[model samples]
Structure formats: C-alpha cells, structure tokens
Target: SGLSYPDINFKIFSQGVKNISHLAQFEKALRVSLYSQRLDVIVRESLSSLQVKLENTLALTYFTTLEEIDEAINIIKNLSNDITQLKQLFIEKTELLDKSSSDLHNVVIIEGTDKVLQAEQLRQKQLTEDIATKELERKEIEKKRDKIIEALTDARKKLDNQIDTASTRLTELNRQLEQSEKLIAGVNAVIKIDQEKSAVVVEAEKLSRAWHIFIHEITALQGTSLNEVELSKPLIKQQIYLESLIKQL
Candidate 1:
C-alpha cells in the first residue's frame, strides 16, 4: 500500500475536527434562533406605532447579527449528514407552517421576522416619502400663488400706467382747450373794442366835416354885411357847444 498509517489517522482526526466544528456552529445557530423568536415576541409587544419604529431599528440590528446565524445554520445544514434531523430540532416552530414554505421561510422565524420588520420599514419609509412628496406639492402651490400674485400685480400696474398715460394726455388736451378758449375770448374783446373805436372815429370825422363846411361857407359869405355877422354868430354858438361837449366827457 502507498498509504501510510499517519495519513489514515490524520484523515480521521480531520473529520472529527470538522464534525465538532459543525456541531458548535449548529448549536450556536439553533440557540440564537431563540433570540430571533425573542425579538419577534418582543417586537410584537408594541404594535405598529412609534414603538414599531423603535423596534424596527432594533430589528435591523438583529437582522445584521442574525444574518450571520442564517449563514452559519445554512453551512451546518449543508455539511450535516441528516438535514431532517437538524430541522427536527425546531419541530415546535413548524406547527402551522406549510411544507410549501420556501427555503427562506423553511427557517421560518428568522426569515419571517426579517421579512415582517422589513415590510414595516417599507411602510415607515412610505410616510417619509409621502411627506416629501406632499412638501413638493406644497411648493408647487406656493409657486402657483406667487405667479398669480405677480400676474395680478403687473396687471394693475400696467393698467394704471396706461390709464395714467391717457389721463395725463387728457388733462393736457383740456389745458389746450382752455388756452384756445381764452385766446378766442381775448380776440373777441379786442375786436369789440376796435369796432366801437372805429364807429366813434367815423362819427367824429363826419361831425368835423360838417363843422369845417359850415366855417368855409361862413367865411366865403355872399350875404349883406350885417347878415355875415349873424352867420358868424352861428360859428360862435357851434364852437362853444362843441367845447362844452369835450369838457363834460
């Protein structure tokens, strides 16, 4: 035989060490499974309230730690000579569980606990996400209100600006109307005074023409000597009356 006695002994020793290592790992996993159960029962004490959030934090802590337990148990199951014998250790946990349960739920309590708590975290995140979504919607409404205020403010501002423009032009036009009316009144007054002065000048020119003609006739008189005196007396009376009219006015 090419094999030595030491080789066979070393093989046996290695197998024994492997078996003991698996036993330690299996025992640790099976007992720690109770800690998962403890959490399930403990986490259940407080329902889906704020305590659920608190427990959810603790659940993640347990999940991170228990994930190692699952890996360890899975390794033990893979290495075990009898998987059914290993599962029989948790027969009490399998009371109402379906045989149709997948491998994930085959280790029911840990998987189910992780699944349940992860779902709670999922529901919890929905609250935070929905609040963020609602806050975004509120910002949208605020923007809409701001836009409306800007639109309305500019509407009044521009409308008043146009109104002021037209109104100011209207006042200037009215001022022009006043100036035009005043000029017309001034022209009318000046025209009236000019017409009255022209009439007076025409009357005075006719009266002066009559007085001059009488004086010429009187100076060139072809009457008797003493008749010229009576005519000259007419000149005196006419000149005196004209002098009295000039003084009174």
Candidate 2:
C-alpha cells in the first residue's frame, strides 16, 4: 500500500496476534485521520490529570504495599520511649511542623513549613496592621466629616443671619419707599397749593395796580377841582372794580 512505512514491519502467524495487531492498524488509521484534521474536534477532550491524580491518591491505601506500610510503622516503633524524640516524631508526622517551628524554640525539622508559617504570620500581622491603619483613617474621615458638618452649620447660620439682615434691610427699604411715596404725594399737594397761592398773589398784585391807577386819577381830579359827578363817576367805577376783585378773591 502507498501508506506502508519502511521502518515498520508487520508479520502475522496466529489469530490472537492478528486481533491484537488490529490496534497498531487502528493507531496508524487514527494518525492518518488526525493529519487530515478529522480528529481536531476531540483532540483537546480528555480526562483531567489532577482528577486522575486525586483518584489515585484516594485509592492509595487499598493499593499500597505491605512493605511500605510496615516501614512507616517501624519508624514510629523505633522512637522507643524517648519522649522528646517521640514528640518530635509526632510533630513531623502530623501537620503541626508549621505551628511547632513558629515558636521561639525552632525545633521542627520540616524545611519550608516554618518559613511558610512565618510568611503567613507576617501576612496576618500585615492584615491586622492594615485594619488598624484603615480604622485610623476612618476616624480621620469621621473627624473631617464632623468638622465639615460644623463648618457647614456655621456657614448656614451665617447665611441665615445674612438673610435675616437682608430681610430687615428690605423691610426698611420698603418702609422708606412707602414714606417717599407719601412724601411725594404730600409735595404734589403742596405744589398745587403753592400754585393756587401764586395765582391769588398775581391777581392781588393786578388789583393793587388797578387801585393805584384809580387813586392817581382821583388825585388828579381833586387837584383840578372836578365836579362831584365826574368825581363820583370815577369813584363809582373804581369801587365797582374793587368789589369785583374782592369777589374773585
């Protein structure tokens, strides 16, 4: 076949061997399909390695060898009544190496557990310090909020006082406006009265002028010894003019 490889050789002698050999044929066929992009969809679909590892670890006791178990048991047995060694053995065997090494004594043997605990404790302390720092910042914020509230309150008070002062000023201005309007009305009345008084004075001045003219004509007639009738005519005309002026007044 054109697909035959020179490096791979196949020979068959038994039916069982031939049946098993079908796997190799299938492997070659799968490779051919993969190269043609036919297996692209299922290529990435597989069991998770972590899930497999977890399943294997969970079944470890069932599949574990007697030799391995015996070795673990013998180690504990070898500690042999030595309290400190047994205690150390327990701390190492259990997960307490982190807590054991974190004490000031530094007795734990597991290498990185102490360092990890130190790092974790450092993180815990940092978190606590951060909480304290944030609490202080919150207090500062609250203080600032209080100060702002006080300042705003004072400002509002001042604003209200200013508004009250402005209101008072406006009231005074309104009163002044009313007084000014009333004064204007009174001044208009006085102006009318003054105009009437002026008109009366003008008429009185004209009457006085007329009286002077009449008295001058009478004096001239008296000097000429005019007749009583002539004198009476002028006198009667003057008297009538004076009476008319008085009536007008």
Candidate 3:
C-alpha cells in the first residue's frame, strides 16, 4: 500500500503483442491463478506470449522462415539458462541437508561418549572408596593382632619369671635342710658322750661305799679309822649331781 510495485511479465507482454496483433481484441486470455489480485493481467500476458512462441515454433517447422526460427532459438536458450539455475539451486539444497545430517550424527556420538565417560568415572570413584575401606579394615585387623601378640608375650615372660623364682626358693629350702641335718648330728654326739660319762661316775660311787664297809669291819685288828668324807660325802654329792644331769636329759 505504501509503495506497491506493478506485477508484470514484460517478456510475455511484448511477445503477446507481436503474436495476437490481428485478433488481439477477440482472443480469450488464460487464467494464471485463482486468488492472485493481478491474475487477470498476468494471465492475459501469459496467454499472448504462449501463442507467439507457438507461432514462431510452427513457422520454423513448416514455412521455414529464418526470422521465426531465430526467435524460437533465442527463447529456447533463455529457458535453458533458467533450468540450469534451478538445477544448481536444487543441488545446493541437497548438499545443505547432507551436511546438516552429518553434523547431527557427530553431535549425537559426542553426547553418548560423554555419558559413557561420566558413568565410568562414577564407577571408578566407588571402586576407590571400596578399596580404601578394605585397607582400613586390614589395618585394624593388624593392630588387633599385634595387641594379642604383645599380651601373649607378656604372659609368657611372667610365667618364666615365676618358674625361676620357684626354682630358687626350692634350692634355698634344700640347702637349709642340709645345714639343719648337720647340726642335729653334732647335738646327738654330745648327748651320747654326756650319758656315757654319767654312767661311769655312778658305778665308781657304788664301789667306794663297799670299800668303806670293809674298812670299818677290819678297824679293830690292824687298820686306821675310815672318815665320813670318803664314802657318804663323795657318793651323795656325786649321786645328786648325776640325778640333776639325768633330769636335764
């Protein structure tokens, strides 16, 4: 509405004016579109151009007019140029689709690779944690074993010390018993000597008493008088001392 340009096919208009010159007003134009606002104008021009082109081609086929043949050849050359341009556009469109398809496939493969790498990294992390946990357990077990071994070693040392202490006490007791046996033998020897001396002294006293009695009986005839100090005193004193010694025994 602001600056509307005229819609026209100049080549078709010019060709129609040349082809429909004689019955131009009477000839019916073809319709180019059903909804185009300028369809009437474009169809009239197109129908005129098609009749001129048909004439030019028909003249060249039968009448063999050099001018008509030249015009037809020019039309064919222009059509060939348009067809070539359209073919080039089609090839370009097809190449663009091929490139887009290849790009899309590459993108999909890259995404898949990234996902696989992420999954592998997660699995590796889990495995590392598991290995670390196992190592901790192994260390704990080693520590416990060391503690048990230490306790066992201490117990063995203590047992050995006790055994040595018991052996030393036994040896001391045995030595004490040997010394006591020697002392007992010495005391027994002294007791035997003392008892034997006491018995000899008792017999001497009894014999002295008998000798005194014999002295008294013979005093009248030829002997000196016997005294009390010889028999009674010596014998009584010896008997008292021997009785006291025997009581002590």
Candidate 4:
C-alpha cells in the first residue's frame, strides 16, 4: 500500500516570519505546522501497521507443514497393523479357544483385548473430532458463499437498473436524432424547391427580355420603307430567334 502527503504551502512560514511582531501571524504559522505534524504522525502509524500485516502475510505465504503430514501418515500405518493383529487374535479366540481356558492364559488374553479396545476407542475419538472440524469448516465455507452470492445478486440488480436507464436514454436520444434528421431533410427539400423556383423565374425574365427586344425590332422595321420581300427576310429571321428563345423558356 502507498501513502501520500497533503499539499502544504511551506512559503506560509516565511511569510509569517516577515511579520514577526504580529502575534496572530505567528500563531497561524504554528497552527499550520501543528496540523502538518499531526497528519504526519498518523501517516507514519498507518504505514507501520500496514507493513507489519504485509510481513505477517508474506511469512504465511511460504509456510508449509509437509513433514508434519508425513509423520502423521506413518503413525496411521503402524496403527493399521496393530488393528489387523487385534482383529485376527479376536477371531481365533472366538472360534478356536475353549470357554473354560486356564485363568493365567485368560488373564493375558484379557489384557491384550483391553489394550486393543483402548486403541480403537482413541482412534474413534480422533475420527469423531476430525469429522466435527470438517463439518464446522463446511458451514463456514457455506456461510461465506452465501454472502458472496448475496453481494453478487445486489451488484447484478444495480447493473441491470443502470443498463435499463441507459437503454431508455439511448432510445430517447435515437428518437431525437431521427426527428432532427427528418427536419434537416425537410429543410433540404424546401431549399431544392426554392432553387427550382428561382431557376424558373430567371428563365421567365430571359423570355420576357427576348419578347421586348423582338417587339422593338418589329416596330422599327415597320417604319422603314423596304420592299416587302426584303422586309420579310429580317422579320423571318427575328421570328425564328424569338421562337427558339420561347422553346428554351
């Protein structure tokens, strides 16, 4: 873990010393230093504690008891032999021995029987303890898993709500975007219509100017004293130009 210090204006001390006669200025400087010292102490303490914990965890990370496990396995193997021998002896005593055997021999057998029974009792007790410990571990693990599941469920619900909100916002934004696009298309269509109308108006103006020129020329020709055939030639040419202009319009 890392620790960071707060930003402090060390220049404040210099500024305060410049006005040394003012007690209030010095007091302010002292207060700032005191606060800084306090925070520094807290950070040091926190670092010390954190380092100790990290060191302990690091030690545990490398710690192992494999030798201890091997020792336990060896003990259990020896105990298995003892158990087998005890069972065989009991079977022989039950099936082959007389009920009225000598007291001395019976007493020796009873002692061996008692030792085996005690060993079995001790093994049973150990097994019972191990079972109980395992059951406790199982319960603890189950409890931790349940807490994890609950936390995950809570996180999933919150995520789902966020997604739903984002989805709704996106839908609204898409709708607005569609409306904006439609408005732009309509504006473009209006601009196209206006451009076409302007073109038509320009064409009409050109046609009107052509008609005015044609009429002025015809009037001037009517006042002139040309032969009818000679007049018809220029008049026919003007008529053809006017018809072409009208067709273009």
Instruction: Identify the leading candidate in terms of lDDT.
Output: 4
Per-prediction TM-score, please? 0.33, 0.31, 0.24, 0.34
Q: How accurate is candidate 4 locally (lDDT)?
A: 0.38
lDDT of 3: 0.36
The Cα local distance difference test for each model comes to 0.37, 0.35, 0.36, 0.38
Candidate 4, after superposition: displacement of residue 245 in Å? 3.5
Worst ten in a row by lDDT for model 2: 4-13
Return whichever of 2 and 3 wins on lDDT: 3
Ranking by lDDT: 4, 1, 3, 2
- Please give, for residues 24-137, the per-residue lDDT of candidate 4 as tens digits: 220122432333333333323432443343344234322322223444654334333433343343333322222211211222112233454455556556555555655565
Error of 1 at 247 (Å): 3.9
Residue 238 local lDDT, model 4: 41
Model 3 C-alpha lDDT per residue in residues 1-249, reported as the tens digit of each score: 122122222333333333323222210111111111132233333333433433443343333323335566554354334333433433443344334323322321122334544555565566556556555654665555556667466664555554455455556545554554544444443333233323322322332233233223223222121232242333233234323322321
- Screening candidate 4 with a backbone cut-off below 3 angstroms (N, C-alpha, C), the clashing residue pairs are none
**Pairs clashing in candidate 1?**
none
Report how far residue 154 has shifted in candidate 1, in Å.
3.1
* TM-score of candidate 2 against the unseen true structure: 0.31
**Per-residue accuracy of model 2 over 136-241 as CA lDDT, tens digit each:** 6546655555566663566645555544554555565556545545544544443333333333323323333443454345345422332333534543454444
